[PDB]
DNA sequence: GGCTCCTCTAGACTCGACC
DNA sequence: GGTCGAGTCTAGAGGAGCT
């Protein structure tokens, strides 16, 4: 199974009881190993480039994991309590019954709480990032961060864009993001029909949409777009309205808030399921691009070639797996099966012939063909292949 | 306890027995200076079971030692002198050693040798030619023949000149030995290398001044170049080298295409070396008749330096520290240039006290709304292409601009020169050509000398403008206020800077010279005194320059040293079993390309190893000697001769005045705590100056015949220095004799001017220390005996100590901390502090014998 | 003008004037980085990642939660996670009492999870995980950039870039000195004044050797990175003494690797490089500056110029160069003001496209370092920008 | 009292580039 | 076939290194 397969190749992490459908979706454990982080690091970059770099009037936001906290009910965010203060009450003076009741109330009245979504992080930065565009609309605020949802406490890395758009054409902009997000998720997908959009409505009646992924157990909302309007923005900014109004083309209009929210921890599971003895991750998402090894002796001579070759690829931004450093040996086929399930794009072998004319063996993950290529032409081919796949 | 009439302590009875009216005059001179009386406490008596001295007296003993040590090699040299062989033979392009008749390795015991090396490969030998009786020999490297894509960048005995009681001769045999495969092994294969250059320097050596004039005595001497030596000793047709210089300036392909010519240009040199040696050998055996001289020279020709994997680490760390410390200095200068380009705007450069006199001219670049809503899906592709095509259309205007790209017209002229061209392969952003030595850097840094801005005159060098594009005299006055009335170096009014008096900066060599760069370390004391106060770094620039000055000059030598790493199979069993051994490391050696002679004083010279490059706390790469670390199982026993030349001069003075130790005031002060000059002048001004111990004659370039009362200083210096070289010869001969007779596993490591180091196993180390002490004692006894003195003082009988240390360093207690080695040798490498043992401790540990 | 005020105006900092104090910036109890400061840190975190995880061998990423399991140790001061519903359920659904409520408070300190204080304990939980990855081949390491919570009470958050190095005890004194040298070079690589980064040896409460990097902030030196020779006790604490799972291959034999912790402060790192780099210009390193190109338009025709700039914008963005689209600004800005605006924002180059560009294709190209305007053809603009940035690395 | 090597700078010749 | 603004090479001078 993929859950076990990603465990062997260090895409997954945790005990056998933690590699379960309910536990993986929970986020109560570190579900990614050394390789899974880098693949999830690629989704963070691909999301960032296509939603911030190439997009007009989108800016970066970083927000605290904790929130100020409130005494209102119906919220289940886990609070943060100082153990020293807890030990202070129990050990110092033996407070009365009334004090203990007050202490537990104080743990909800003033104690901070962990964040559940990144929307409130952007809203406190709306005023300062409004100044960034000289109060022009539309614009957005994007962020990737870990959010906590109760279950214990689960950790979910959400990629959220808060798009501020005028009240007019808010539905059109929501369809604009709905199409781009559906195209962005389907851009890397080997099965783009697994990503779906469905119309959904908020409890307050506000319009919205969801993006699912057809996991083998069912479709899970990897991404959800809500047309929040201005109620959420006015909640964080009550009273004066001048500081909230953006300068539209004809009048000052409070921008309706579009909440484009997506989960990269859950997204990475989608692209792990989508790729699956070879994980055919998209060339922009595979965490390991090049696998370098030494074919035979002389080990000292070949390892210098690989180390020189490795230093060239690393300086070019291409991630490499220095497999030549291992003292153990296995058959070439065992290396091929090992690398495929590791989603290694290309496997490079430095043999004696590399010392004679510079020709090396270049195996492609997608086609299983070995191409004989000169050492100097290796880096040119790798950059060309990655550049074409990005576009 | 034995005392001379002058109360000087001498050898004890036990040592004296085994080894071996003018008093009133001596006291009168002694009391006149004020050294009469004042006795000293007697040192503890030393007794040893010295081996029976051969031939009776010490002189005959050392003569017998030399005649038993160098006997086979004299015959080996004589074999060439009467050898017969066919003339210079076609060149062979094959691999390995080829025998040019009328074998895997040359078999004969005599070989005139020369090696040619392509500098493109750096250090690996390219080809070599060997002269041997009855057959020539030629060598071709496997890198020259096969032409593979890449080779091993680390050297080893595998890719070296192979071989296998034998004498090898050449013009710079060092080079020949440094490329021989078997000379890097810790096991000492019995081969000795004899140099024609060293024998030339011994016979007709030209001094430092004489070679300058040579490049009378001119007809009897010549320079060390092979052509000059061949013209001197043999003459005939002159030698010619190929003007192409393929080995030095040409690539490997050119050497491949001209192999049949390089194999002739090398064979010619080998034959010339043989012809020179034919006349050098009898002439040198005549000039220096004492066999100890030749034996000591052959022992100086086998210097061997072991290293380990730390050598590559040393090179990498030193180079990276040099770069980073240079990058910090370079990047600090570049920012000063960038911050000055802003003075162009508003014509403010004319008010800068330092950058007014620069090129600020500029060239010219001459040739030949409401929200629309979300863009629709079709607008996405439409907008993309129309913007993309609006650029690809402009790509056709490439031919509307000049072919040669005009270089930074916007940047001022002085900044353009500091910025490399865009097409330069070494182009770096900003003023990448800045350096402290440039004439703009003292102007960029806004340097001040005692409150005055600096300025450069094309004749007088760097100076400062004392107030009194037009120079901003107002700015000069303004700076002085912020910081006739000056009387430094003479004000040169020929410069004629308006409103200023140009006073030159002081120089170390006097006012007759000019200052070329105010960043010279000579001005470092002036920097701290507050006179030469820099502006926008500062002293840190001078500190960086001081720290990297050694490595800047010496990195192309140290990094280029030919290190051959021994494989595990070639290491001795001792190293493969010592607890300090590690399989993940590699161990090797450096063969110092030491010329046995090289001066008129017959001193051995080498730019890297035979220079006193002791570790410094403020120098990058100065731990060079500390990187000579014995492999596990071995140690470096050594000693420093206490006042070698000083005691030689004293004993020469003592042997002349009253014929006893301490009779001279100089000798009295030397032994404890102008007669020497008279004897030195008598020896130098004689018909043929000779060493007062081994009778080695002076070079034919300094005999009074050719030079009629000329170069007196060189001769008088030569007397003492050649006596020191004789002392070294005696020490090396006696050490080799004691090593071979008593079967001590060791070999000669290296001998700097005044040190003697030996690579010996820790097992037999105290035995080696006792051997060294005995050799010292015997050498001192012979030196006293040959001068007409029948006794030797106790105070100089034995060394102060004999060092036993894991690495090469001046003292065993030094950790060798440098900017590139801040943790020292104890922390970074685990080398413990060595042992220093006096004579008594060595006696106790060795029980008085071996 | 002060640096904090400058960075607040140019969106390197974010926060109220009360949150921009010296102590408040050190604590981390508030998101202190604006849209540009996040990009400066995102560059700094990428520079650390390339130097320590990409270029270095035997270094891997690690995923560690923000929550550590509850420890009953009284010396612990980490904040605990408490369910708000659990507090309400006990307190409101029944009558409380002095006897019964203490059972709930005692259970909090005993079982409830806690916010992590360092990335070390996350690496130790993944130590065994990497032993399979590297086939036990000592030495190796795990590196991570994440948020660590430390009490101030208030919960301060600072982004720590940790490297937990597992080496045998013989080379522990060597790798501790190796990383201390390797770290001090990386911090000094981007600094305008490398002398401000210093190292001083320190000893902890157990006498173990250590080394702490500093940056000479204007108020005083701050320990942005501390290195420790922790030893075996941290591994002996997390793992119940079963030596089989702790020993790795240190050559021929097997030895329990000595733990070395290098713990840089990324959030304090950007603060140093903002102080290090500071006419008013943030002379940030080209590999650290958030904005590198600043496009623009001329007098007119603006419609034709914007077609060129939009095509130019996609040319640079597809080539990995951050661009500031200054041609979309709705208020006309003079050159003198536009230049100082780009300088304070640490913009490397101020590209300007005018009507002349439509015929010959030459665009002006100003430099932050030199403030000198040089013209260049559009076709060669990308080549120079890539070359300048590649040579700055 | 001597050199020698590295680095920076000025001047004269060459070139090909444009016209 | 003409001027002329970059390459290029040689020559000169000064600092650091050894006696």
Coordinates of C-alpha atoms in Angstrom, one line a residue, chain B residues 463-812:
Chain B
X463 CA 53.0 62.5 -0.6
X464 CA 50.6 64.8 1.3
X465 CA 49.4 68.3 0.3
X466 CA 50.1 70.8 3.1
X467 CA 47.7 73.7 2.5
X468 CA 49.2 77.1 1.8
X469 CA 40.4 69.8 -12.4
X470 CA 41.8 72.3 -9.9
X471 CA 42.8 70.8 -6.5
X472 CA 40.3 71.7 -3.7
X473 CA 42.8 73.7 -1.5
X474 CA 39.8 74.9 0.5
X475 CA 38.8 71.3 1.2
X476 CA 42.4 70.5 2.2
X477 CA 42.3 73.4 4.6
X478 CA 38.9 72.3 5.9
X479 CA 40.2 68.8 6.7
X480 CA 43.2 70.2 8.5
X481 CA 41.0 72.4 10.7
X482 CA 38.8 69.4 11.4
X483 CA 41.9 67.4 12.4
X484 CA 55.8 76.6 7.0
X485 CA 54.3 75.0 10.1
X486 CA 55.4 71.5 9.0
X487 CA 59.0 70.3 8.7
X488 CA 58.8 66.7 7.6
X489 CA 60.5 65.4 4.5
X490 CA 61.7 68.1 2.1
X491 CA 58.9 69.9 0.3
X492 CA 59.2 69.4 -3.4
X493 CA 57.9 72.6 -5.1
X494 CA 58.4 71.1 -8.6
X495 CA 55.0 69.3 -8.2
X496 CA 53.4 72.8 -8.1
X497 CA 50.0 71.9 -6.8
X498 CA 48.2 75.2 -6.5
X499 CA 47.8 76.5 -3.0
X500 CA 49.7 73.6 -1.4
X501 CA 53.2 72.5 -0.5
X502 CA 53.9 68.9 -1.5
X503 CA 55.8 67.3 1.4
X504 CA 56.9 63.7 0.6
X505 CA 56.2 60.9 3.0
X506 CA 59.1 59.5 5.0
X507 CA 60.6 56.2 3.7
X508 CA 62.5 53.4 5.3
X509 CA 65.5 53.7 3.0
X510 CA 65.8 57.5 3.4
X511 CA 64.7 60.6 1.5
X512 CA 66.6 59.5 -1.6
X513 CA 63.7 57.1 -2.4
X514 CA 59.9 57.6 -2.9
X515 CA 56.9 56.1 -1.1
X516 CA 55.0 53.7 -3.4
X517 CA 52.2 52.6 -1.0
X518 CA 51.3 54.1 2.4
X519 CA 49.9 50.7 3.4
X520 CA 53.4 49.2 3.7
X521 CA 54.1 47.5 7.1
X522 CA 56.8 50.1 7.6
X523 CA 54.1 52.6 8.3
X524 CA 52.2 50.3 10.7
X525 CA 54.0 51.8 13.7
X526 CA 53.0 55.2 12.4
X527 CA 49.4 54.0 12.1
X528 CA 49.1 53.3 15.8
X529 CA 50.9 56.5 16.8
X530 CA 48.0 58.5 15.2
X531 CA 50.0 60.0 12.4
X532 CA 48.8 57.9 9.4
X533 CA 45.1 57.8 10.4
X534 CA 42.9 56.2 7.7
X535 CA 39.4 57.5 6.9
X536 CA 36.6 55.2 5.8
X537 CA 38.7 48.8 8.2
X538 CA 41.7 51.0 8.5
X539 CA 44.3 49.3 10.7
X540 CA 42.4 46.0 10.0
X541 CA 43.4 46.4 6.4
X542 CA 47.1 46.5 7.5
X543 CA 46.5 43.6 9.9
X544 CA 45.0 41.5 7.1
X545 CA 47.9 42.4 4.7
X546 CA 50.4 41.4 7.4
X547 CA 48.6 38.1 8.1
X548 CA 48.3 37.2 4.4
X549 CA 51.6 38.5 3.2
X550 CA 53.4 35.2 3.8
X551 CA 50.7 33.1 2.1
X552 CA 50.3 35.6 -0.8
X553 CA 53.9 35.1 -1.7
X554 CA 54.2 31.4 -0.8
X555 CA 50.9 29.7 -1.7
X556 CA 52.1 29.0 -5.3
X557 CA 55.0 27.1 -3.7
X558 CA 53.3 25.4 -0.7
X559 CA 50.2 24.3 -2.6
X560 CA 52.4 23.1 -5.5
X561 CA 54.7 20.9 -3.4
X562 CA 54.7 17.4 -5.0
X563 CA 53.1 15.3 -2.3
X564 CA 52.9 11.5 -3.0
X565 CA 50.4 9.7 -0.8
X566 CA 51.5 6.2 0.0
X567 CA 48.8 3.5 -0.4
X568 CA 47.9 1.2 2.5
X569 CA 49.8 -1.7 0.8
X570 CA 53.0 0.3 0.6
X571 CA 53.0 1.4 4.2
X572 CA 55.3 -0.6 6.6
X573 CA 53.7 -3.1 9.0
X574 CA 54.5 -0.8 12.0
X575 CA 52.1 1.9 10.7
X576 CA 49.4 -0.7 9.8
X577 CA 49.5 -1.8 13.5
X578 CA 50.0 1.3 15.6
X579 CA 47.0 2.3 17.7
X580 CA 47.0 5.8 16.1
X581 CA 46.4 4.3 12.6
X582 CA 43.1 5.1 10.9
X583 CA 41.8 3.4 7.8
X584 CA 39.9 6.5 6.6
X585 CA 43.1 8.6 6.2
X586 CA 46.0 8.5 3.8
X587 CA 49.6 9.0 4.5
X588 CA 52.4 10.3 2.3
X589 CA 55.6 12.3 2.1
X590 CA 57.1 15.4 0.5
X591 CA 60.6 15.1 -1.0
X592 CA 62.2 18.6 -0.5
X593 CA 63.9 19.6 -3.7
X594 CA 66.9 20.6 -1.8
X595 CA 70.2 21.4 -3.6
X596 CA 73.0 20.2 -1.4
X597 CA 75.1 23.3 -2.2
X598 CA 73.7 26.5 -3.6
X599 CA 75.9 29.1 -2.0
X600 CA 79.6 29.9 -2.0
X601 CA 79.5 28.8 1.6
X602 CA 78.2 25.4 0.4
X603 CA 75.0 25.8 2.3
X604 CA 71.9 23.8 1.2
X605 CA 69.2 26.0 -0.2
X606 CA 65.4 25.6 -0.7
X607 CA 62.8 28.4 -0.9
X608 CA 60.2 26.5 1.1
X609 CA 61.7 24.0 3.6
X610 CA 65.2 25.3 4.4
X611 CA 63.8 28.7 5.4
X612 CA 63.1 29.4 9.1
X613 CA 59.3 29.4 8.6
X614 CA 58.3 28.9 12.2
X615 CA 54.7 29.1 13.3
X616 CA 53.4 32.6 14.0
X617 CA 50.2 33.6 15.9
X618 CA 49.5 36.3 13.3
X619 CA 50.3 34.6 10.0
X620 CA 48.2 32.5 7.6
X621 CA 49.8 29.2 6.6
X622 CA 52.9 29.6 8.9
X623 CA 52.2 26.2 10.4
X624 CA 53.8 24.7 7.3
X625 CA 56.6 23.0 9.3
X626 CA 54.1 21.8 11.9
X627 CA 52.4 19.9 9.1
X628 CA 55.4 17.6 8.9
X629 CA 53.9 14.9 11.1
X630 CA 55.5 11.5 11.5
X631 CA 53.2 8.6 10.7
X632 CA 51.9 6.5 13.6
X633 CA 54.7 4.5 15.1
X634 CA 57.5 7.0 14.2
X635 CA 58.9 10.1 15.9
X636 CA 61.2 13.0 15.0
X637 CA 64.3 13.0 17.1
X638 CA 66.3 16.1 16.6
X639 CA 68.6 18.7 18.1
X640 CA 69.6 22.3 17.7
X641 CA 73.4 23.1 17.7
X642 CA 73.9 25.7 20.4
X643 CA 75.7 28.6 18.8
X644 CA 77.3 26.6 16.0
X645 CA 79.0 29.4 14.0
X646 CA 79.5 31.5 17.2
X647 CA 81.4 28.6 18.9
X648 CA 83.3 27.9 15.6
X649 CA 84.5 31.5 15.5
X650 CA 85.4 31.4 19.3
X651 CA 87.4 28.1 19.0
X652 CA 89.2 29.5 15.9
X653 CA 90.1 32.5 18.0
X654 CA 91.1 30.3 20.9
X655 CA 93.3 28.1 18.8
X656 CA 95.3 31.1 17.6
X657 CA 95.9 33.5 20.5
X658 CA 97.3 31.1 23.2
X659 CA 96.4 27.7 21.9
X660 CA 93.8 26.8 24.5
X661 CA 90.1 27.1 25.1
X662 CA 89.0 30.4 26.7
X663 CA 92.3 32.2 26.1
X664 CA 90.4 34.9 24.2
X665 CA 87.9 37.2 25.7
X666 CA 85.4 36.2 23.0
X667 CA 86.1 32.5 23.6
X668 CA 85.9 33.0 27.3
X669 CA 82.5 34.7 27.0
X670 CA 81.3 32.0 24.5
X671 CA 82.3 29.0 26.6
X672 CA 80.3 30.0 29.6
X673 CA 77.6 32.4 30.8
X674 CA 89.8 40.1 17.6
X675 CA 92.0 37.0 17.4
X676 CA 89.1 35.2 15.7
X677 CA 89.1 38.0 13.0
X678 CA 92.8 37.8 12.7
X679 CA 92.7 34.0 12.0
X680 CA 89.8 34.3 9.6
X681 CA 91.7 37.0 7.6
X682 CA 94.8 34.9 7.6
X683 CA 92.9 31.9 6.2
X684 CA 91.0 34.1 3.7
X685 CA 94.0 36.0 2.4
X686 CA 96.2 32.9 1.9
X687 CA 97.1 31.5 -1.5
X688 CA 94.1 29.1 -1.4
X689 CA 91.7 29.4 1.6
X690 CA 90.8 26.1 3.2
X691 CA 88.4 25.0 5.9
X692 CA 90.4 24.6 9.1
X693 CA 88.9 21.2 9.8
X694 CA 88.2 19.2 6.6
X695 CA 90.5 21.3 4.4
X696 CA 87.8 22.1 1.9
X697 CA 89.1 24.7 -0.5
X698 CA 87.2 27.9 -1.5
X699 CA 85.6 28.3 -4.9
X700 CA 87.8 29.3 -7.8
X701 CA 85.8 32.5 -8.1
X702 CA 87.2 33.7 -4.7
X703 CA 90.8 32.6 -4.9
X704 CA 93.1 35.6 -4.5
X705 CA 94.6 34.9 -7.9
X706 CA 91.4 35.8 -10.0
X707 CA 90.2 38.4 -7.5
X708 CA 93.1 40.6 -6.5
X709 CA 92.1 41.6 -3.0
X710 CA 88.4 41.5 -4.0
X711 CA 85.3 40.2 -2.2
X712 CA 87.0 40.0 1.2
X713 CA 83.7 40.0 3.1
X714 CA 82.5 37.0 1.1
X715 CA 85.7 35.0 1.9
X716 CA 85.7 35.8 5.6
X717 CA 82.0 34.9 5.8
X718 CA 82.8 31.7 3.8
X719 CA 85.4 30.6 6.3
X720 CA 83.0 30.4 9.2
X721 CA 80.0 29.2 7.2
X722 CA 82.0 26.4 5.5
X723 CA 83.3 25.4 8.9
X724 CA 79.7 25.1 9.9
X725 CA 78.9 23.0 6.8
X726 CA 81.9 20.8 7.8
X727 CA 80.3 20.5 11.3
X728 CA 77.1 19.4 9.6
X729 CA 79.0 16.9 7.5
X730 CA 80.6 15.4 10.6
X731 CA 77.3 15.2 12.4
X732 CA 75.5 13.5 9.5
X733 CA 78.4 11.0 8.9
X734 CA 78.6 10.0 12.6
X735 CA 74.8 9.7 12.9
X736 CA 74.6 7.4 9.8
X737 CA 77.5 5.3 11.2
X738 CA 75.8 4.9 14.6
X739 CA 72.5 4.1 13.0
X740 CA 73.9 1.5 10.7
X741 CA 76.3 -0.2 13.1
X742 CA 73.9 -0.5 16.0
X743 CA 70.9 -1.3 13.8
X744 CA 68.6 1.6 14.7
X745 CA 65.5 1.8 12.5
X746 CA 65.7 5.4 11.3
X747 CA 66.7 7.8 8.6
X748 CA 67.8 11.4 8.1
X749 CA 64.7 13.6 7.9
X750 CA 66.0 17.2 7.1
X751 CA 68.7 19.6 8.2
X752 CA 68.0 23.3 8.2
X753 CA 70.9 25.6 8.7
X754 CA 71.3 24.8 12.3
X755 CA 69.1 21.8 13.0
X756 CA 69.4 18.0 12.6
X757 CA 66.1 16.0 12.5
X758 CA 65.8 12.2 12.3
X759 CA 62.7 10.0 11.6
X760 CA 63.0 7.2 14.1
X761 CA 60.6 4.7 15.7
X762 CA 59.3 5.5 19.2
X763 CA 60.7 2.1 20.3
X764 CA 64.2 3.1 19.4
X765 CA 64.1 6.8 20.3
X766 CA 66.3 7.1 23.4
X767 CA 68.9 5.0 21.5
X768 CA 68.7 7.7 18.8
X769 CA 69.0 10.4 21.4
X770 CA 72.1 8.9 22.9
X771 CA 73.5 8.4 19.4
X772 CA 72.9 12.1 18.6
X773 CA 74.6 13.1 21.9
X774 CA 77.6 10.9 21.1
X775 CA 77.8 12.3 17.6
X776 CA 77.7 15.9 19.0
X777 CA 80.5 15.1 21.5
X778 CA 82.7 13.4 18.9
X779 CA 82.2 16.3 16.4
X780 CA 83.1 18.9 19.1
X781 CA 86.2 16.8 20.0
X782 CA 87.3 16.5 16.4
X783 CA 86.8 20.2 15.9
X784 CA 88.9 21.0 18.9
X785 CA 91.5 18.4 17.9
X786 CA 92.0 19.7 14.3
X787 CA 92.8 23.2 15.6
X788 CA 95.7 22.1 17.8
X789 CA 93.8 21.9 21.1
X790 CA 94.3 18.7 23.2
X791 CA 91.1 19.1 25.2
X792 CA 87.4 19.9 24.9
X793 CA 85.4 22.0 27.4
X794 CA 82.5 20.3 29.3
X795 CA 80.1 23.2 28.8
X796 CA 79.8 22.6 25.0
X797 CA 80.4 18.9 25.0
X798 CA 76.8 17.9 24.8
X799 CA 73.5 19.4 23.6
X800 CA 71.3 21.4 25.8
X801 CA 68.5 19.0 24.9
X802 CA 67.4 16.5 22.2
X803 CA 63.8 17.0 21.1
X804 CA 61.5 14.0 20.6
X805 CA 58.3 15.3 19.0
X806 CA 55.6 14.0 16.7
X807 CA 55.9 16.9 14.2
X808 CA 58.5 19.5 13.0
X809 CA 58.6 22.7 15.1
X810 CA 61.1 25.0 16.7
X811 CA 60.3 23.7 20.2
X812 CA 58.3 20.8 21.6

